[PDB]
Amino acid sequence: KAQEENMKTTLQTLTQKYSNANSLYDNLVKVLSSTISSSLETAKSF
Amino acid sequence: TPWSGYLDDVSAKFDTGVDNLQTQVTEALDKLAAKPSDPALLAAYQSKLSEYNLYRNAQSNTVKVFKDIDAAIIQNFR
């Protein structure tokens, strides 16, 4: 059972890496500012 | 030979003052027609377009004011 709780905590670490991957991907998808914030440059063409 | 009065001379002086302003605007607008967001021509687009606008306004106002002076002189004969 000690070995099995070690396996279970390994699986818990891999699952909890949701907060390590999706959490930062949610604001990594904010590279779209390169589209929106570079679309307010219409002042260059008035 | 192509005749040119003083007002025509002033207009030609403005045309020869700018090298290829009409042409420069032409290629700037043509280049922007396919690359709308790109730098170094968008700013060039706005600068050349404003340059052309001020050029045309200056030419029109100068010929108008010289015409006003000349008309005053001609009318003042009598």
Curated annotation (Swiss-Prot), chain B:
Changing Y6A: Decreases invasiveness. Abrogates host cell invasion and effector secretion. The lineage of its organism: Bacteria, Pseudomonadati, Pseudomonadota, Gammaproteobacteria, Enterobacterales. The levels of PrgI/SctF are reduced in an invA/sctV mutant, probably due to protein instability, and are increased in an invJ/sctP mutant. Pfam families: T3SS_needle_F (PF09392). Changing D68K: Can secrete only early substrates. Can assemble needle filaments in vitro, but shows a filament assembly defect in vivo. Can invade cultured epithelial cells. The keyword Endoplasmic reticulum does not apply. It comes from Salmonella typhimurium (strain LT2 / SGSC1412 / ATCC 700720). Changing L7A: Can only secrete early substrates such as InvJ/ScpT, PrgJ/SctI and PrgI/SctF. Can polymerize into filaments in vitro, but not in vivo. Cannot enter cultured epithelial cells. Disruption phenotype: The null mutant strain is non-invasive. This is SPI-1 type 3 secretion system needle filament protein.
